Write a structure and sequence with these properties.
The complex is a heterodimer of chains A (about 180) and B (about 80). Chain A has about 180 residues and is an alpha/beta fold. Chain A has a single domain, classed as Cytidine Deaminase, domain 2, CATH 3.40.140. Helix content of chain A is about 25%, strand content about 35%. In chain A, the strands form three sheets. In chain A, strands 3, 4, 5, 8, 9, 10, 11, 12 and 13 form a nine-stranded mixed beta sheet that branches. A two-stranded antiparallel ribbon of chain A has the order 1-2. A two-stranded antiparallel sheet of chain A has the order 6-7. The longest helix of chain A is centred in the middle third of the chain and has 13 residues. Chain B has about 80 residues and is an alpha+beta fold. Chain B has one domain. Chain B has one helix and six strands, in the order E-E-H-E-E-E-E. In chain B, a hairpin with a 2-residue loop joins strand 3 and strand 4. Chain B starts with a strand and ends with a strand. Classes of the chains: A alpha/beta (about 180), B alpha+beta (about 80). Strand 7 of chain A pairs antiparallel with strand 6 of chain B. The structure holds zinc ion (2 copies). Chain B: This is Ubiquitin. Chain B: It comes from Homo sapiens. Chain B: It is a peripheral membrane protein.
Chain lengths: ~180, ~80
């Protein structure tokens, strides 16, 4: 019913995203958004009959400020994912006061996820603006630009179009499905 | 020798290495081959997180050993 393709002609499998995940993520990281701090999570799930299903929203050990966040113990996250047979399907984070877009840091992070999994998505929540977005780099051209980039900045700019929202409709299909939040903090 | 690097996305990366390569060298090879910067890479073997300055031989990593790659996350 959907057959999605990259800019480069590569087919993308469907990712089923629980309709409720965005709000649930906002609910779980509210104490942080309320204290003007970003939070990140990992979108975890499984492959069944050639489609991915996000089943677990994993909040890893991390540190944050008003305009950054980052993991601080990836070994534990690995242990958890490996024990429960959970794939990395993408990630999510808040812009508590900012607009909804992909920052330089976000694109650099995302590129690696998307090279490892062409379907990988980055969800950005901008709760002050009541907006949100689901994004990916252009493949191959945007992934190429980020791969070849080597500038410190780390809000540094990039040449050309690099990223895009996922198409509507496209490979990410929202559905009314269960979700487990795993808080590793 | 060849080693394998398994991801959390169902992907396995094959690498050409020698026993005396450091972990730093290994992450550079991953960058060369796959486009992931070393600073985003965390490598794990036999339950331990590997250190840049030590060698494959130091961790007993041999012909056809499997390491695991887990990415950092940085957002803004
Ligand atoms: Zn850059
Ligand atoms: Zn961001």
């Amino acid at each position: 019913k959907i057959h999605a393709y990259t800019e480069g002609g590569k087919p993308l499998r469907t990712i089923y995203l629980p309709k409720l995940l965005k709000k649930v993520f906002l609910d779980v990281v509210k104490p942080n958004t309320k204290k003007n701090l970003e939070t990140c999570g990992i979108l975890c799930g499984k492959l069944r009959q050639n489609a991915f299903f996000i089943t677990h929203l994993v909040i890893p050990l991390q540190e944050a400020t008003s305009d950054t966040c980052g993991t601080t113990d990836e070994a534990s996250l690995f242990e958890f994912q490996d024990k429960h047979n959970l794939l990395t399907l993408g990630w999510i984070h808040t812009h508590p006061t900012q607009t909804c877009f992909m920052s330089s840091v976000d694109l650099h992070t995302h590129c690696s996820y998307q090279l490892m999994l062409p379907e990988a998505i980055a969800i950005v929540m901008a709760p002050s603006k009541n907006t949100s977005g689901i994004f990916r780099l252009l493949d191959p051209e945007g992934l190429q630009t980020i791969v070849k980039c080597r500038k410190p900045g780390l809000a540094h700019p990039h040449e050309g179009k690099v990223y895009t929202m996922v198409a509507q409709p496209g490979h990410v299909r929202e559905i009314n499905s269960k979700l487990q939040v795993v808080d590793l903090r | 020798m060849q080693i394998f690097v398994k991801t959390l996305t169902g992907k396995t990366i094959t690498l050409e290495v020698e026993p005396s390569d450091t972990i730093e060298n290994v992450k550079a090879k991953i960058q060369d081959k796959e486009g992931i910067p070393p600073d985003q890479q965390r490598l794990i073997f036999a339950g331990k997180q590997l250190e840049d300055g030590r060698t494959l031989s130091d961790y007993n990593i041999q012909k056809e050993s499997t390491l695991h790659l887990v990415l950092r996350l940085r957002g803004g």
